[PDB]
Amino acid sequence: DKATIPSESPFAAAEVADGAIVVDIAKMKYETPELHVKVGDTVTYINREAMPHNVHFVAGVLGEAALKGPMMKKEQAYSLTFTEAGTYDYHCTPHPFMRGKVVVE
Ligand SMILES: [Cu+]
What we know:
Layout lengths: L2 E2 L6 E2 L8 E6 L2 E2 L3 E4 L4 E6 L8 E2 L9 E2 L7 E7 L3 E6 L7 E6 L1
Parallel strand pairs: 3-6, 5-11
Antiparallel strand pairs: 1-9, 2-9, 3-4, 6-9, 7-8, 10-11
Bound molecules: copper (I) ion (CU1).
Subcellular location: Periplasm
Cofactor: Cu cation
Pathway: One-carbon metabolism; methylamine degradation
């Protein structure tokens, strides 16, 4: 796998690390739909709205299997640590018109 998962559970927005790079989710959009990070960085998604959201990378993107993240309730967060350069597209499972990408460089 080209990413590791610190927490399989979502966790509270207050529990977000220092140093993680935050992507907020609100108004049915990922607020930073194109994020550029370095190898080794942790990206933390934070749901800021009532609608539950996840991030979903299809098979072959972050590793062999699809990475279907857990649903985040409002004010919950979920992190991924990227270990290899590349472009990693994702979408929201229930709302697949929501799309973003992480470019690791
Ligand atoms: Cu969503």
